[PDB]
Symmetry: D2
Subunit: 426 residues, 4 copies
């Protein structure tokens, strides 16, 4: 139909308690109506985040059994190095345990104090200039590649601040607003030409780059018949490097990396490792983990894997939408946001409608959701890769639909004291 069956079989499961409502209420009480303080063993479906809770393949698990734990010269590192080179086309790679990690070196490495960094990604040394196209900012409405950079604004910045004062342009693919919005291959190539004209560097935040690639393949004219791998290799052809949190699109539970083409930039990058470590290593990334990341990255290239990933989120969004549930449109490639203000018009900001909606979803279904501030009150439903089925999406949708039909019953809360905050029903 519109929704493809999973392009894999289950190799192993994680059993669940399957605690009833009365029990879920107790737990919810004890967590003080704060979903973020719920124990993992008490949740059926955990949609808190799409970061690090991916299900790995049996291939990745075989790879975890072959960790070459040398401090240096690890064969797992060559594996990863070769994979990134081949798929992303970047010369050098500096592995980190976190994306944040990769992000730090680059900044250190590429920003002189009082220089500018601009990007589509909405303060130390640098000033960030949000250069996204203005209807990126928008909700409800649809412009396909909402995260595209506004070339007039980029050109303008260049004009009035000088190319010399621009550290680099940072383009996130996909950009993480409204559940991840795509960037066109057309805009990536335009950006490369304008910037290159002024000797400006371009770094991508490649975290959900496979998600981006699917959007391109699916909706950008001329890419209909290209491989995800072909799209991925071309996207990166327009950047000087990238930073990646492998915990998202690499189908791993940990890892990140910093990539570049620049010899010099590279050299220096290793130095900073040395200054921060004393000895250059794998940024405290086990050999087994580099191996699993290398295998996961290639697995991410299967079209059926990413099509199914995106449409599962799509499916939840659709189901919610066609029942009248107040959701934020357009639906991203990795999360669905409930509109808490519309959901609970009866409660005011002061009675924490999102917080309270999150609590009810859990009491009714065994589903954990995250309260938001995206500044509208949204309850986020973020979906990890390969962990859940459509039947699991049905559990989530059905319960929210029934909640919605009784929205009036959702009671407000009071701070009987945040990720630490404890509350009580007013």
């Amino acid at each position: 139909m519109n929704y493809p069956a999973e392009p894999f079989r289950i190799k192993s499961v994680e059993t669940v308690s399957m605690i009833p409502r009365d029990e879920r209420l107790k737990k919810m009480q004890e967590a003080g109506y704060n979903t973020f303080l719920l124990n993992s063993k008490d949740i059926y479906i955990d949609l808190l985040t799409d970061s690090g809770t991916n299900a790995m393949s049996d291939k990745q698990w075989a790879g975890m059994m072959m960790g070459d734990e040398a401090y240096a010269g690890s064969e797992n590192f060559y594996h990863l190095e070769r994979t990134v080179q081949e798929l992303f086309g970047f010369k050098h790679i500096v592995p980190t345990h976190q994306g944040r990690g990769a992000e730090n070196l680059l900044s250190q490495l590429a920003i002189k104090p009082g220089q500018y960094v601009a990007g589509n990604m909405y303060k130390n040394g640098a000033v960030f200039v949000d250069i996204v196209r203005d209807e990126a900012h928008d909700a409800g409405l649809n412009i396909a590649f909402k995260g595209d950079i506004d070339l007039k604004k980029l050109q303008k910045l260049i004009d009035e601040k000088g190319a010399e004062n621009i550290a680099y342009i940072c383009l996130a693919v996909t950009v993480n607003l409204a559940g991840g919005q795509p960037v066109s291959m057309a805009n990536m190539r335009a950006v490369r030409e304008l910037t290159a004209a002024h000797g400006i560097k371009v770094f991508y935040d490649a975290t959900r780059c496979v998600e981006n690639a699917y959007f391109i393949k699916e909706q950008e004219q001329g890419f209909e018949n290209k491989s995800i791998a072909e799209i991925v290799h071309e996207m990166f052809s327009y950047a000087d490097g990238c930073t990646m949190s492998g915990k998202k699109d690499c189908l791993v539970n940990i890892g990140g990396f910093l990539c570049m083409n620049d010899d010099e930039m590279f050299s220096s990058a290793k130095e900073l490792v040395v200054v921060y470590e004393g000895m250059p290593s794998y940024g405290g990334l086990a050999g087994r983990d580099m191996e699993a990341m290398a295998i996961g990255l290639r697995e991410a290239m299967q079209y059926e894997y990413i099509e199914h990933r995106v449409k599962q989120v799509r499916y939840l969004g659709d189901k919610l939408k066609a029942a009248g549930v107040p959701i934020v449109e357009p639906v991203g490639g990795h999360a669905v946001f409930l509109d808490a203000r519309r959901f609970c018009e009866h409660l005011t900001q002061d009675e924490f409608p999102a917080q309270s909606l999150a609590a009810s979803i859990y009491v009714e279904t065994g589903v954990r959701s995250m309260e938001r501030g995206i500044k509208l009150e949204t309850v986020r439903l973020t979906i990890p890769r390969r962990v859940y089925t459509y039947a699991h999406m049905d559990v989530v949708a059905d319960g929210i639909i029934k909640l919605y039909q009784h929205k009036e019953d959702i009671r407000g809360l009071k701070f009987i004291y945040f990720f630490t905050a404890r509350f009580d029903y007013i």
Copy 2:
């Protein structure tokens, strides 16, 4: 709807090729239109058997990392013995590498030459005492697996009390893809047999699937646990033999359980007389551990309700579309009626094999032609491996083929004759 979402999350996946129709046709041609000859790597969904392709949990995998491989006094053996004692309520257990190994140990311990054996599912003479309806495939009757008490009485009477080794009760019984045996039938058989001092041994291979049926259908058990039903089932038996490969959620193993102290000693000597030293009959410590853990997981109501209903979901969708299926749907398989499906073909024009071949080409699903005699195509479902979406791939494929039954060409031999036979279209 009527069907529960999986009571588990996916911990790891097995990646699949997802080869297109064009390559499937070719592989089919190459396999000689014999699905038994297809390679595992070329199969999307493999419904050939429910035996041994079960997905283990992460707890089962943690057990696999801790096998105590001592030849004697293994911690794993103790865990397995405890577990079975507690849930089956059998005093003694003889681990084996296969169901079939436990059986032949029983047959060689409990039968005197020329003695009869009587049961619901098929030296020695085999007497079939299952009620007559067991034999009617189109008839939707509950607990079709029940033994005919009168047929028992007749056997008892004409041959006498010790001309009978024992009575063999298979739960569920493997005709029509697992038909249950009511507890009432089990309490009955015991009674009649214990009076004459006769022995009853159960084939516990799909005993949890049977338990689910009793709890779901046998007026009186609605509020009894799966563990409570199981425990009582075996209170009406002298022992059982179990193939772990089925309801224990493991890929290998079985065991022989008895209550009789003597028989146990005889049994044990018979292992020392086959091996040299008493063993765990070619069962690794890691395997006894995973099997112990799996028996326990098999007892969660939500697990088994989900298991049986996923099968029923497949059955219902076929049923409601007019696809001729065996009834009632069993606990682990759905059988298509190939004769009625392909009325245009002849036993001679091999309707089952051709049906099975077309199914594969159309969907990437492997089924095996069968007979239970009746000419069927068996869709056997492994535990915790597939989803509802996977059931749909299977269901939609068969329905489209059904809507063109007439287009299914017949086959001829172009050469046991089952597992190796090659065919060509007519």
Copy 3:
């Protein structure tokens, strides 16, 4: 010195209790001075058998994570078939769950009732054609396992050519803990037998251990690879049966290999006639993968030289201290002469059992009383599990006991009678 350091690093360990002498005595008492009755958790070093307690490599563990558990067309089966074809040079392979399962499949395929079988290691009549020295335990002669060609000729002659099923060659032969068979003996036996059209099947269980001996002792093989020796060994046979649990570095599995096309078909039908469907005879896909990988690892010269020399190291230290041992030392075990050790006791006062009991109390090492008849204590060594330091714990313990042989009290029964027997001091 004379003994190589391990050709491997430790990837993971198995933790041990390290219980003191006082608690060991008690456990011994509780086990009734029967080491067979000790619990695995109470043992420091377990030298009961070399069968199945082998340590697998991380490559073998990566294989275990990738079992393709399809009932037919498993990728694992293909890997295993390739591997054996290539190294053993046998055309066909029938996987089995045990060595013993492969054997009985052979015996039931290659023997006609009343036929004799002849070999070096012990319906049907068993003729022992090994040279007479094989039988002298105190005699240090090389290649003690060789078949007496004249004894063969005599058997051939008095009973005639087809009154003989086949000739059974065990390499190494399991008397004196693994005595080798020279290639020359193997080329000879073939010759004589192929003339009369007679069949030779090898018991390849410890075939790599045999290869090491040939390469080390048989003038001519010094520069031939372990793989080259192995390959040629099996060029003199019709097939073999192998217990994977020994030289394949796995905890379970075996196989039947033949060259004969017909026999293979018969064999295969005999699995379909025991199972219903041709199987992998209760061998998981993960297991065929680990066994394939293990055969290959068994071929590294450094692995097997280390294996055999670690055993020899134990032998040398006993030897040089005056401890009465069986000679020459075999490829996988050292046997103490209990009669000579404990000259003060009588067959009646159970010298072996008491020796084995004292060893345990003193060192935390489990050995088993044996007979090969001669009354010994067998110290069997698993592959890649222990170190030289572990050999020392064993060696020093026995030497201290030796220096007080006289203090070893005799035992009596306070009750097969082997595996369950309980004793008390005299």
Copy 4:
């Protein structure tokens, strides 16, 4: 004897290539005589560092199979939290992926610019005052607990800078100089009293705290009969918290943690996580890794495990020492340093004697060592936990002894261009 056999069995191995000398020379050439540029697959024994290459138990590996990957409320985190609380007696724990990580928060958390930090551990905001006792600084000579803080110097600092200007006292146990030197329980308790008298905080660098505990148990009067666990719990009773790199003494490949008792300090610590992450998590530490760390920490408490750890290093040191090899005394608990200046008096600093010694050790034995600057030229031999045997220590010793006896042959090198530095033989 003086050297205990390993208090464990091998569960799995990592196979090695076992490349010969001529091949090792080539590799050495290609690495440009820089051991730090050697591939892991080409090394037999890798003594580069004692950081992160520990062999985990089968218990830890079972624990890696049970990773609860929730972003929050992970059961693995409770596991670890409970273990640290029980063993170290600290209230709160903030897990990190690296020790360095833990180190960073504390600094941020506990140092006001221009405050002092003093410790036994030889510049941002703070001034470090080395307060070790002066014969800590020493080589050759022996004072048992060489890392003890000089109380007169601590008192003096307090006197002239003011208690208010001291951020905290940092005590590393063991201190990492000369391969790790111990601190007395007597000195830890003295420090707590003096500091506490002035309201000064004390933080320990607990990285090799189990190593420390052994030294105390072994050489500090009154601890002879205390448990390692009893010693460990008491050491921590004298500190406000600690930072730990679990990669050392926790027998893991990754992880660290920051511990404290202070409610407030704790609260704030979480905030910093939030400022650096956005959401409080496990400092980017997988659930499987926290689980493995929890189990490893407890395993570290086995006396026989740590005694054997320390004496293995001791054994190498001893063997080297009794042959006349120039080593740095006293021998630490985790490494042996070769004196390169004395080893190669024929080469000058300018011809990089350490660098060149490291290269020769590798060419001759297949052993990788690290060039040092500890400012004497030393070649470091650092030993990972549970990976190597005494036979492996013999390989290392024997080769260095023969090198030593030919020291004159070691040729100097020239920079034909550091951890990146390539050289050539002059």
